């Protein structure tokens, strides 16, 4: 019942009080998100949105949380949906 | 002696067996004290999170792991502090605190000699010292063994200025970080969360009443972000589940709602209060004094940023713990502390905010003062105060206190909510949405109905489902609104989305997402109003299904909308359903359809529907659309047939020669009944315009005509004069904003206007005219047989030579009422000689535009004298000019005369000194109808901007 | 003689309600239509309605617009004399500087008057006594440069990492910063007091080339794709070529130059002299200079619009004026308290900062 995550200095504390939660398949989630951190950090800088991937669910579902203002959230979600759709095909 | 300290420290902290382990969330913290970049090695780590999460457990487990091993091995020493358990006023020294923490004292001398290279501190709390900080000036302490109250030592150790090159770990609150971020030097921030989302969903699901309304109550509880955020801590989730179970048990006895935090908290607290009473009765006087003192103490603590509540605070309000325990029986105001002094902190911050809110209701019931001996942090208190105005809580409070409850603050809340609606330049949607949320918190019909009665205009942004629900709920009680605007950018952007959050579906059979249900409810609420007549789609992007639902629900028999707008929306999928709606609702008579591309089939269907006798639209716009020649043929075929359109626009789209001749043939016949036609920004050649005027020659139906931003030759203007000279023309307004007309054309126009009626408005903006042709125009309109009222010359090449002619024209004329001089080099001599004849006032002009005419402070006296005695003048404009102080004072003194009747004045007041501001304020004070605004062209008395919408 | 009088500007709705609630609590324990400005939403936009125009613009004239008035929304409280400002609206930040440190603020907070910075970077404690003069910010908002009077170099900070820390030094032993510049090819520039403009390499910190001129001749510096334009109290403007490394052109002006600027789109160069006389010089044709304006005060700042259709000017004369690029006509003013010394404008042309004595006021552009 405890989760730890780092927060960069440039992310304001006021915009962390309303996550967005989206659910989708775990097997595609692991392959799309990847393992390394450099590309992920660059993506977070580009879209100005922070994301964390959780796979504690027992089923084939994984939880993805995105933080930011509504425009940034929408753009970042669209990027992920397009990437996942391309990877699935 | 280090092993003895190790044994003592493992002995003292031992409270968690299965809570501390080699979790993967702890290795990150262990590796955190390593250089991420080769250059940078962090020295201070600050932990933050929600107030209820177990952070003190993390610090305690860190110390225990150091004492046992496999957590911090290079670290030779750790020290734990707790500031919420020690007073922060007495004078002490770092040695004294370290001796209090460390049983032995002979170790520190060898410790500080060489260890500061490796020496770690662990600190808990530090969020309640945001109030002691005087903010004026504090002396930094550079070395220990100093007698000085401990808060200064905390400041000094925080600056890395007392014991440098020493690692620190700090635990604090999210809202206590406002003053701390400028104290530490290059930290590393780590964020802590509570439970996950799926676990929260399942826990809330397991505790619902399930009385045939489980879906709505569940979704209202879960989608509310404000409640779900603080439901992160396990304690608050347990409290909410307990309250729901309590409501389930005594279901018929509770009239309080279960959709908001205020209801559940009131349920729990009042049930606990009533448990102590053997029978339903009134609280005794001493119980009343105790309750009042506790609530008012919570209120002051919230105000002053204190959450420790020392014993002297308890004494000052004549309160004791035994009475609280006897009266409440609930875990309220727990006692913490191990020394002689005691500390009293509530079981949560939510309870303190709730009691602070409850204070304001009970303030004026009696005079309690005799028995007492004396913006982010206030969100919870404000929300709770809003929610406590429900009538059932008030009734229970009346029963308890044997006195009717009429709180004073209700009038103040109603006044504040009303002040938003009456705004001079429209309503800011942020305040409107915030007020909607706060009013949905208080589920009272009377309060909501009394709050929303002066809105008359609404603008919303919808990007969350709870926003849809709160807007749909609160809109039913707005009975004066007339225009709305919805900006749904991305919620409905994707057509299809079928997914389930939990492992199994929440409901056995849904078959249709909740979002579609809430959208349908909002659209039906919009459709069922009475006084609403204008609907605007704003900046939204809709799919097929959303448009289908909107069209179906707007076919109802109670909707009275007359104007429909789509000028910035992508609705290309649902145009079929729009055409279907077009001929089933007869109350609409205005359709704006700009910027949406149309194919052949869409235009064919639109034309077929528009011909249906049931249809009743009188205005239609199709600007910036991509049309074809077949589209123009269908436009002509619709135009000739029996229809009810009176205004048609074809702006911002190139028109071919075949289209031109087809349109001219269709328009030429006498069976086409049109009043107005707009054709600006289209690609017409001089030949095409010649055929257009030749076709218009035989028509006697149009009254308005626009040909702006077009290429017009001398043959075209000559043909236009030929057509408009002969009788039964019935043209009243002419629009020539950018067609290049020059030389002999103005002579023709002056000859025509010399003796001609039925012409009322004429504009010649952005056209190359000097003084020579304006001479002819003024001479022609000088005659009594002209009936023009308004002349527009905003961007003509007009100079100061003809100002004498202008003055004579003004003093001699008898008909025209408006004069615009926008971007002409008028100078000062021209303006003074114009006002020389303007002051005498032999005419009845009412509108004069003198913007951007290069006016200095030398012409102020003449303008002041002219406006001093001229009761006919009504409007004026003076923007984009400079003025000295003395000239402005003279003008302001002229504004204050009892004879003037100025109604609208065009100025920007935020570009002068203070004295001119005060004089303008006094001008506004004496005359209560003068409007001093810079948006001079937004005032529309008669329909002047009819071609721009 | 005339004195501006200041007043509490925002008084937004929420502040009014909080004041009302606070008043009641103090009132009880004693025995013993109004005008509101719109919120600056999310730190980005204001959500207002545009003004009306007498006519309709051309089909191709869509992104060319001209502002009409400026409205104040907030005040930033430093304590020491303001010298330079930056925005970098990509990250919604504000950097302000004085003679003793750099204070980083944020614009997301909705506060009527701010006094809490996001950090406080100072370099005085490092040495005995060092001052700060100027700052610069890269285009992509990933690096911050700063220079001083007694500094052993120009410090480089990194702003894309999970922490904020020093990165480089860029040595320079006994020369004052007095100017700064950057280029798109990953190189840095600086122009010291006695006229040397030295080019370092960003990725390795090696001196690449040195350029030398008369004293005080590098007070201002603007770069183009392959040219460098410099000029100072010497009352001359000269162009250097990096490839060829000697002077190419020289012009003489009447009075001491105080600022420079370059149009993002066209080939015009803005110059602001010491008697208020604006000028424009063609960078490519290099034919002649033409004077457009005249004022009674000196000029201490110029800047172009992102679309290059207008420019603003600040100075000693208590005023902040805006002019239109085509000919240079005056549009409007806004008065201030004292000699305004700095300002900056965001990328999107939505805000404009300004600092007079110790307050960094933020205005809003009303199109």
Please explain how this structure is put together.
Chain A: This is Oocyte-expressed protein homolog. The complex is a heterotrimer of chains A (89), B (949) and C (367). Chain A is an alpha+beta fold and 89 residues long. Helix content of chain A is 42%, strand content 26%. Chain A has a single domain, classed as K Homology domain, type 1 (Ribosomal Protein S8, Chain: A, domain 1, 2-Layer Sandwich), CATH 3.30.1370. Chain A has helices at residues 26-33, 38-47, 70-88; strands at 3-7, 20-25, 50-54, 61-67. By secondary structure, chain B is an alpha/beta fold. In chain B, helix 23 (544-553) packs parallel to helix 24 and helix 25 (600-610) runs parallel beside helix 26. Helices cover 41% and strands 9% of the residues of chain B. Chain B contains 36 helices and 26 strands. Chain B starts with a helix and ends in a 16-residue tail after the last strand. In chain B, the strands form six sheets. In chain B, strands 10-11-12-13-14-15-16-17 form an eight-stranded parallel β-sheet. Among the domains of chain B are: 2-192, 3-Layer(aba) Sandwich (Rossmann fold), CATH 3.40.50; 285-407, no CATH class; 408-490 and 520-565, Leucine-rich repeat, LRR (right-handed beta-alpha superhelix) (Alpha-Beta Horseshoe), CATH 3.80.10; 785-949, Leucine-rich repeat, LRR (right-handed beta-alpha superhelix) (Alpha-Beta Horseshoe), CATH 3.80.10.10. Chain C is 4% helix and 38% strand. Chain C has one helix spanning 13-28, and strands at 69-77, 84-86, 93-97, 102-106, 119-121, 132-137, 143-148, 155-158, 165-168, 180-183, 187-191, 197-201, 207-211, 220-223, 227-231, 236-241, 247-252, 259-262, 268-272, 278-282, 289-291, 299-304, 310-315, 320-324, 330-332, 342-345, 351-355, 359-366. In chain C, strand 22 (299-304) and strand 23 (310-315) form a beta hairpin.
Secondary structure layout:
The complex is a heterotrimer of chains A (about 90), B (about 950) and C (about 375).
Chain A: E1 3-7, E2 20-25, H1 26-33, H2 38-47, E3 50-54, E4 61-67, H3 70-88
Antiparallel strand pairs in A: 2-4, 3-4
Chain B: H1 2-12, H2 24-32, E1 44-49, H3 55-68, E2 78-82, E3 91-92, H4 94-101, H5 107-114, E4 120-124, E5 148-149, H6 150-158, E6 167-171, E7 188-193, H7 197-205, H8 214-223, H9 225-230, H10 234-249, H11 261-276, H12 285-304, H13 311-316, H14 321-328, E8 334-336, E9 343-345, H15 349-361, H16 379-387, H17 391-401, H18 409-421, H19 429-441, H20 445-451, E10 458-461, H21 465-475, E11 483-487, H22 514-527, E12 534-536, H23 544-553, E13 563-565, H24 575-582, E14 591-592, H25 600-610, E15 619-621, H26 629-640, E16 647-649, H27 657-668, E17 676-678, H28 686-696, E18 704-706, H29 714-725, E19 733-735, H30 745-754, E20 761-763, H31 771-781, E21 790-792, H32 803-812, E22 818-820, H33 829-840, E23 847-849, H34 860-868, E24 875-877, H35 885-895, E25 904-906, H36 914-926, E26 931-933
Parallel strand pairs in B: 1-6, 1-7, 2-4, 4-6, 10-11, 11-12, 12-13, 13-14, 14-15, 15-16, 16-17, 18-19, 19-20, 20-21, 21-22, 22-23, 24-25, 25-26
Antiparallel strand pairs in B: 3-5, 8-9
Helix pairs in contact in B: 1-3, 10-11, 12-15, 15-16, 16-19, 19-21, 21-22, 22-23, 23-24, 24-25, 25-26, 26-27, 27-28, 28-29, 29-30, 30-31, 32-33, 33-34, 34-35, 35-36
Chain C: H1 13-28, E1 69-77, E2 84-86, E3 93-97, E4 102-106, E5 119-121, E6 132-137, E7 143-148, E8 155-158, E9 165-168, E10 180-183, E11 187-191, E12 197-201, E13 207-211, E14 220-223, E15 227-231, E16 236-241, E17 247-252, E18 259-262, E19 268-272, E20 278-282, E21 289-291, E22 299-304, E23 310-315, E24 320-324, E25 330-332, E26 342-345, E27 351-355, E28 359-366
Antiparallel strand pairs in C: 1-28, 2-3, 3-4, 4-5, 6-7, 7-8, 8-9, 10-11, 11-12, 12-13, 14-15, 15-16, 16-17, 18-19, 19-20, 20-21, 22-23, 23-24, 24-25, 26-27, 27-28
């Amino acid at each position: 019942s405890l989760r730890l995550r780092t927060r960069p200095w440039w992310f304001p504390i006021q915009e962390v009080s309303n996550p967005l939660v989206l659910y989708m398949e775990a097997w595609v989630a692991e392959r799309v998100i990847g393992t390394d951190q450099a590309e992920i950090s660059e993506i977070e800088w580009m879209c100005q949105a922070l994301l964390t991937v959780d796979s504690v669910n027992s089923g084939n579902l994984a939880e993805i949380t995105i933080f930011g203002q509504p425009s940034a959230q929408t753009r970042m979600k669209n990027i992920l949906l397009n990437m996942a759709a391309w990877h699935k095909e | 002696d280090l092993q003895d300290y190790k044994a003592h420290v493992i002995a003292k902290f031992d409270t968690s067996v299965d809570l501390h382990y080699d979790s993967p969330e702890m290795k990150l913290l262990s590796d955190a004290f390593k250089p991420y970049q080769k250059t940078f090695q962090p020295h201070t780590i600050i932990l933050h999170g929600r107030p209820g999460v177990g952070k003190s457990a993390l610090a305690r487990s860190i110390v225990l792991g150091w004492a046992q091993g496999k957590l911090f091995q290079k670290m030779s020493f750790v020290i734990f502090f707790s500031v919420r358990e020690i007073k922060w006023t007495e004078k002490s020294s770092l040695a004294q605190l370290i001796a209090k923490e460390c049983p032995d004292s002979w170790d520190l001398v060898t410790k500080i000699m060489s260890q500061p290279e490796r020496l770690l501190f662990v600190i808990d709390g530090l969020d309640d010292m945001d109030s002691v900080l005087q903010h004026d000036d504090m002396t930094l302490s550079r070395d220990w063994k100093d007698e000085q109250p401990i808060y200064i030592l905390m400041y000094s150790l925080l600056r890395k200025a007392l014991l440098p090159q020493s690692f620190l770990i700090i635990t604090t609150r999210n809202t206590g970080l406002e003053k701390l971020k400028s104290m530490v030097v290059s930290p590393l921030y780590i964020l802590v969360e509570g439970l996950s989302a799926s676990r929260r969903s399942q826990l809330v699901l397991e505790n619902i009443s399930n009385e045939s309304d489980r879906i709505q109550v569940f979704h209202s509880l879960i989608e509310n972000h404000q409640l779900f955020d603080q439901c992160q801590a396990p304690s608050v989730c347990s409290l909410v589940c307990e309250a729901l179970q309590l409501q389930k048990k005594l279901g018929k006895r509770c009239t309080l709602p279960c959709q908001t935090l205020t209801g559940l908290y009131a349920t729990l607290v009042f049930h606990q209060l009533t448990l102590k009473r053997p029978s339903q009765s009134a609280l005794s006087q001493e119980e009343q004094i105790t309750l009042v003192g506790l609530c008012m103490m919570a209120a002051e603590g919230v105000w002053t940023m204190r959450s420790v509540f020392y014993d002297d605070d308890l004494k000052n309000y004549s309160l004791k713990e035994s009475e609280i325990l006897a009266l409440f029986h609930m875990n309220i105001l727990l006692q913490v502390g191990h020394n002689s002094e005691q500390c009293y902190v509530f079981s949560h911050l939510s309870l303190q905010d709730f009691f602070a809110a409850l204070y304001y209701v009970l303030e004026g019931l009696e005079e309690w003062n005799q028995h007492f001996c004396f913006d982010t942090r206030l969100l919870g208190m404000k929300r709770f105060l809003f929610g406590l105005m429900n009538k059932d809580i008030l009734k229970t409070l009346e029963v308890l206190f044997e006195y009717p409850v009429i709180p004073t603050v209700e009038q103040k809340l109603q006044h504040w909510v009303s002040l938003i609606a009456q705004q001079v330049n429209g309503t800011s949607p942020m305040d409107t949405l915030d007020a909607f949320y706060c009013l949905f918190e208080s589920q009272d019909e009377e309060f909501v109905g009394g709050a929303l009665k002066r809105f008359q205009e609404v603008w919303l942004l919808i990007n969350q489902k709870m926003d849809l629900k709160v807007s749909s709920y609160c809109l039913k009680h707005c009975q004066n609104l007339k225009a709305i605007r919805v900006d749904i950018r991305d919620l409905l952007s994707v057509d299809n989305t079928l997914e389930l959050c939990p492992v199994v579906t929440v409901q056995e059979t849904q078959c249709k997402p909740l979002l579609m249900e809430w959208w349908g409810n909002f659209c039906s609420v919009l459709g069922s109003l009475r006084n609403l007549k204008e609907l605007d789609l704003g900046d939204s992007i809709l799919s097929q299904r959303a448009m289908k639902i909107l069209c179906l629900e707007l076919r109802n028999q109670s909707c009275r909308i007359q104007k429909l707008t789509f000028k910035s929306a992508e609705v290309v999928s649902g145009l079929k359903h729009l055409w279907k709606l077009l001929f089933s609702n007869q109350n609409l008579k205005y359709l704006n359809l700009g910027n949406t591309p149309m194919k052949d089939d869409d235009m064919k269907l639109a034309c077929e529907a528009l011909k249906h006798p049931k249809c009743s639209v009188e205005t239609l716009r199709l600007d910036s659309c991509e049309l074809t020649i077949i589209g123009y043929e269908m436009i002509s075929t619709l135009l000739i047939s029996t229809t009810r359109l009176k205004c048609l626009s074809l702006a911002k789209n190139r028109v071919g020669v075949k289209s031109m001749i087809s349109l001219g043939n269709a328009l030429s016949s006498s069976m086409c009944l049109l009043q107005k036609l707009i054709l600006d920004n289209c690609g017409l050649t001089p030949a095409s315009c010649h055929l257009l005027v030749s076709a218009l020659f035989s028509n006697q139906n149009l009254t308005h005509l626009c040909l702006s931003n077009n290429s017009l030759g001398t043959e075209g203007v000559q043909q236009l004069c030929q057509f408009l000279r002969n009788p039964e023309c019935a043209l009243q307004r002419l629009i020539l904003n950018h067609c290049n007309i020059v030389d002999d054309a103005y002579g023709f126009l002056a000859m025509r206007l010399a003796n001609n009626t039925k012409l009322t408005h004429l504009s010649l903006t952005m056209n190359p005219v000097g003084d020579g042709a304006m001479k002819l125009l003024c001479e022609a309109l000088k005659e009594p047989t002209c009936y023009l009222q308004e002349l527009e010359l905003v961007d003509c090449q007009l100079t100061q030579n003809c100002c004498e002619d202008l003055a004579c024209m003004i003093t001699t004329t008898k008909h025209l009422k408006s004069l615009d001089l926008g971007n002409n080099a008028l100078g000062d001599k021209g303006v003074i000689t114009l006002c020389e004849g303007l002051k005498q006032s032999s005419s009845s002009l009412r509108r004069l535009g003198l913007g951007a005419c290069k006016l200095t402070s030398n012409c102020c006296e003449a303008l002041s004298l002219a406006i001093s005695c001229n009761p006919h003048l009504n409007s004026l404009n003076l923007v984009k000019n400079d003025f000295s102080t003395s000239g402005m004072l003279k003008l302001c003194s002229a504004f204050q005369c009892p004879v003037s009747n100025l109604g609208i004045i065009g100025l920007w007041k935020q570009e002068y000194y203070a004295r001119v501001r005060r004089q303008l304020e006094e001008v506004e004070f004496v005359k209560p109808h003068v409007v001093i605004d810079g948006d001079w062209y937004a005032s529309d008395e008669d329909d002047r901007n009819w071609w721009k919408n | 003689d005339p004195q501006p009088v200041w007043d509490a500007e925002p008084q937004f709705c929420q502040g009014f309600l909080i004041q009302g609630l606070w008043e009641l609590f103090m009132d009880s324990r004693q025995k013993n239509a109004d005008k509101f400005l719109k919120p600056l939403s999310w730190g980005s936009e204001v959500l207002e309605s545009s003004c009306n125009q007498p006519s309709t613009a051309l089909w191709q004239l869509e992104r060319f617009t001209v502002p009409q008035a400026l409205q104040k929304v907030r005040v930033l409280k430093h304590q020491e004399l303001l010298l330079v400002v930056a925005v970098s609206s990509f990250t919604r930040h504000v950097f302000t500087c004085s003679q003793s440190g750099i204070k980083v603020w944020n614009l997301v907070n909705q506060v009527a008057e701010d006094r809490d910075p996001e950090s406080h970077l100072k370099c005085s404690v490092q040495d005995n006594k060092v001052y700060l003069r100027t700052c610069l910010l890269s285009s992509n908002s990933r690096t911050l440069f700063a220079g001083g009077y007694n500094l052993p170099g120009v410090i480089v900070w990194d702003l894309a990492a999970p922490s904020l820390y020093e990165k480089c030094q860029l040595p320079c032993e006994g020369l004052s910063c007095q100017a700064l510049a950057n280029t798109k090819e990953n190189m840095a520039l600086a122009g010291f007091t006695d006229g040397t403009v030295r080019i370092w390499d960003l990725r390795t910190q090696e001196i690449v080339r040195n350029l030398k001129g008369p004293t005080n001749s590098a007070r201002n510096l603007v770069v183009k794709d392959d040219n460098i334009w410099t000029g100072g109290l010497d009352a001359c403007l000269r162009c250097w070529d990096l490839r060829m490394a000697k002077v190419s052109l020289e012009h003489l002006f009447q009075s001491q130059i105080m600022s420079l600027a370059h149009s993002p789109t066209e080939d015009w160069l803005l110059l602001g002299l010491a008697n208020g006389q604006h000028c424009l010089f063609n960078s490519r044709k290099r034919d002649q200079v033409l004077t457009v304006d005249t004022k009674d005060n000196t000029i201490l700042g110029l800047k172009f619009s992102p679309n290059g259709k207008w420019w603003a000017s600040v100075g000693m004369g208590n005023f902040i004026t805006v002019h239109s690029m085509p000919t240079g006509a005056k549009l409007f003013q806004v008065p201030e308290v004292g000699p305004v010394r700095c300002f900056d404008m965001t990328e999107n042309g939505r805000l404009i900062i300004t600092g007079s004595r110790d307050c960094a006021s933020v205005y809003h552009i009303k199109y």
